Design an enzyme around this catalytic site. Structure first.
Site, short mmCIF file in Angstrom:
data_model
loop_
_atom_site.label_atom_id
_atom_site.label_comp_id
_atom_site.label_asym_id
_atom_site.label_seq_id
_atom_site.Cartn_x
_atom_site.Cartn_y
_atom_site.Cartn_z
N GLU A 220 0.78 -1.22 0.00
CA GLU A 220 0.00 0.00 0.00
C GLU A 220 0.81 1.28 0.00
O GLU A 220 0.29 2.31 -0.38
CB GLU A 220 -0.82 0.05 1.29
CG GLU A 220 -1.82 -1.11 1.40
CD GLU A 220 -3.00 -1.01 0.48
OE1 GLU A 220 -3.81 -1.90 0.33
OE2 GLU A 220 -3.07 0.11 -0.17
N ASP B 62 -6.58 6.61 -4.78
CA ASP B 62 -6.13 5.28 -4.88
C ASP B 62 -6.17 4.77 -6.32
O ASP B 62 -6.51 5.48 -7.26
CB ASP B 62 -6.81 4.44 -3.80
CG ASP B 62 -8.16 3.86 -4.10
OD1 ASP B 62 -8.76 3.12 -3.35
OD2 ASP B 62 -8.61 4.14 -5.27
N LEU C 100 -8.85 3.91 3.18
CA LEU C 100 -9.87 4.56 2.34
C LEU C 100 -10.67 5.60 3.10
O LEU C 100 -11.13 5.36 4.21
CB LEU C 100 -10.86 3.54 1.81
CG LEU C 100 -12.02 4.21 1.05
CD1 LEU C 100 -11.54 4.76 -0.30
CD2 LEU C 100 -13.07 3.15 0.78
#
Length: 164
Positions: free
Chosen positions: A11, A20, A32
């Site tokens: 990530e 993203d 998120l």
């Protein structure tokens, strides 16, 4: 290698709101914020999540706290899920990490939808499962990360990450 190091590789770490791969507003280590198109809606969720006026920016510490929460919530979600729990319980340590990774990326519901693959993992049919997991939007959209996870399920080792 551990789940935290694994996810930190997949990530990244960003201290300013970013979009993203799917175009959604995220911050930190894959946290998120909202699927909403409004940067404003994102800044609001962020402040709510941190408990301060962040103006779209957070510290390393804040990013890591969010990360600790997300990993915790990912694991608790698997354990609460009737479809996931039995698979998780059947797995070895490394493969457990692989499932956690998928759940962190795609949420419980999304992973629970991989019915056939889950069945193959439960049965310890490694090669068959890897092939089935690759037939997904998930693999087509983020192939390098998916390949890493898939290799983990296939071999049961951290080879795909010892590179990285």
């Amino acid at each position: 290698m551990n789940i935290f190091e694994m996810l930190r590789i997949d990530e990244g770490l960003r201290l300013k709101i970013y979009k993203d791969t799917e175009g959604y507003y995220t911050i930190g280590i894959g946290h998120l914020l909202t699927k909403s198109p409004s940067l404003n809606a994102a800044k609001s969720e962020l402040d709510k999540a941190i408990g301060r006026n962040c103006n779209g920016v957070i510290t390393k510490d804040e990013a890591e706290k969010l990360f600790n929460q997300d990993v915790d919530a990912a694991v608790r979600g698997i354990l609460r899920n009737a479809k996931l729990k039995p698979v998780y319980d059947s797995l070895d340590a490394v493969r457990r990490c692989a499932l956690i990774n998928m759940v962190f990326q795609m949420g419980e519901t999304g992973v629970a939808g991989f019915t056939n693959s889950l069945r193959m993992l439960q049965q310890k049919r490694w090669d068959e499962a890897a092939v089935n997991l690759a037939k997904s939007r998930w693999y087509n959209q983020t192939p390098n990360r998916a390949k890493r996870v898939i290799t983990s399920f296939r071999t049961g080792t951290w080879d795909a990450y010892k590179n990285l």
